[PDB]
Symmetry: none
Subunit: 123 residues, 4 copies
């Protein structure tokens, strides 16, 4: 997920950087902006009024790129969120209940061969 | 829920589009704004200061439409969020704890018949 | 919780309304702003840059009122959130009936005594 | 250790209130003079609202040092927000069962060891 997110975060930093470096360099020159910017947009604050709507005055191409990135980041945010919910709830103390029962018996098999030792002790 | 949300998202894109296309076309001409806009307002960023308060300088009709949409979207956001919390939680190796205990005893019954058998095998 | 929240939402709509109606009526004249405003601040959007920081140029009294309201609303938001998590989450005695005469058996084998 | 992150967070909240206060008090006193701003500010930035357009980007016109300080603080606060959030999810999902299955099996055997010493004890025959 973190591996997977640092694909999305990385990929779209290369998408919008290669695209809007010509026109929107304040926001998308290189990663002195695109790494911040995508964090800023992932962080749902003045991302439309500050960035997306202004971008889409020039390029309606970015119509989805923003939207998808955010939809995609909010799907993989959730997955991380719930990725710890499931991981630390309920292999622990049930593989120490065979290590008692596997020689609960074993003990007996060498008692039963020690009764059969004085079963064999008549003849 | 996703089916249900793409009703709300769709319905209110038709509400505000049919309404504010006359006066507020920057935000509500057609779905070149209303699909974004509702996403933008659902995304709790410059949604009041950028949109709602300015809208309600002209139309106090939208007083609820915004609010309801958001209240409704935050109820159906939660439902999706918790919709996965319950679904992926919350009979296995307990039918191999009788297969040890069913001859834990069995063993003994042929030891006890070997105390009863070869104690009589005794003086 | 909903009953409890519509205290907080209501109470602070009466706090900031009775206070800033003199100076900040655009945001806090009556409930044509204070019910919205508190929803707007509860909704963590331009709430500081648009509202709080500007409010506190005049009144440093509101220093907490905003903060507390939000801290309080985020505590009672959580409680609602988790209030549904818990609400919709809806071999033992045959392993003593083997072990209670696993032994018993033995006690009448061990009483195999001269 | 269920509400022990609060101790840990009031380190981060405190530490970075001292970071940015000692730094930007010279240039950005509206936001970072002392804790009449830095305690609020960090709450404001932790609260993901106008934090870039209002604060971070403007700060980084003067100081590109704060490039991380903001980012880290937020990354760090969103990791310790989550931990608190999920810190209550697990804590209130509430028990005898399995410490009474060793109290039978620990003398299931014990019994036997004094039976085996009572087979062995009358082996002198």
């Amino acid at each position: 997920i973190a591996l997977l997110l640092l694909v999305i975060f990385y990929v779209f930093a290369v998408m919008g950087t290669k695209l809007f470096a010509q026109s929107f360099p304040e926001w998308f020159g290189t990663l002195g902006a695109s790494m911040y910017t995508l964090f800023q947009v992932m962080t749902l604050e003045s991302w439309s009024m500050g960035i997306a709507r202004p971008v889409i005055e020039a390029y309606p191409w970015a119509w989805i790129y923003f939207v998808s990135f955010i939809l995609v980041s909010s799907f993989t945010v959730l997955n991380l969120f719930i990725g710890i919910i499931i991981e630390s709830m309920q292999i622990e103390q049930e593989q120490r209940a065979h290590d008692e029962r596997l020689e609960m018996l074993q003990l007996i098999r060498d008692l039963s061969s020690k009764v059969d030792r004085l079963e064999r002790r008549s003849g």
